[model samples]
Target: ADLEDNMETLNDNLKVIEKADNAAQVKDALTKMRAAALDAQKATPPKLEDKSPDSPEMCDFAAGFAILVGQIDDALKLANEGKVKEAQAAAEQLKTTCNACHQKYR
Candidate 1:
């Protein structure tokens, strides 16, 4: 359920990116999404308790989420600097990462 919710939030953030006009708007949206991604990563079930090596689901979810958030952070930094084209390109790359992770794990 938590994963579903975070995924929904991520989808919504993607929409924001699509409609974003200026760098500030993109940066703001990225900031919110980054926080959401971090929260989702931290709120994972296995992270709340110790688990064995067989916990592949938990490990993959956490690691993928962290990578997603890192991408967002990089894009956000570029957007904040008014590099709209660069940021948009970076965001596209980040979206690809998200898709790849989801395809492999979730």
Candidate 2:
């Protein structure tokens, strides 16, 4: 899929994480988010389309996705541990990371 599709998946799952009724649902959402974040790393942002893949800007973009994946994994861990509230708290941090990338690249 393209960057847009991956982003939609990530965003949709984030909402699920926020509104899920139980830890299992949250864990499922986090798992999906993590995969989307990883796939996003393969697709260049349209704003960065002209830059070489290994350039600093592109590197930062990929790094940002990596951070998102890590954060999702952390939230997944919390969900797996049955700490639903804490998982949501961790999931909330993802918005900041997303906005940071959007500010520079979108």
Candidate 3:
């Protein structure tokens, strides 16, 4: 799939995390999410006509995505360690960025 597909998958996968009703569900979501985040990071981001490698918008996107990935990875760590609420909190932080970053750049 492409960058647009990845964006959709990224949001969709997060739902798997958010709607998790059990630790196993949460763990599975976290597992899936971490993979998606890496793929998103490795792939070129969307809105390329508006961005260059050295531009401020690109920089912002990069920074925000790093934060997003960190939150995702952290949540996974917490979930794996059995810290349910703490993992959820981190996932919530990741969720907040879904709309915020799109508004800023989309």
Q: TM-scores of all models?
A: 0.79, 0.97, 0.78
RMSD of 2: 0.7
Please give the CA lDDT of all the candidate structures: 0.76, 0.91, 0.73
Q: Which has the better lDDT: candidate 2, or candidate 3?
A: 2
Candidate achieving the largest TM-score: 2
Cα lDDT for residue 84, candidate 3: 77
Model 2: runs farther than 4 Å from truth?
none
Q: Give the C-alpha miss distance for residue 94 in model 1, angstroms.
A: 1.5
**Total clashes for model 1:** 0
lDDT of 3 by residue, 14-93 (tens): 77777777777787877766666666655546565555678887777767677778887788788888887788778888
- Report how far residue 53 has shifted in candidate 2, in Å: 1.1
Candidate 1, TM-score vs. the true structure? 0.79
Candidate 1 local lDDT, 2-61, one digit each (tens): 666777777887778878899988888788778778777765453335655457766776
**Candidate 3, residue 69: how far the Cα is off, in Å:** 0.7
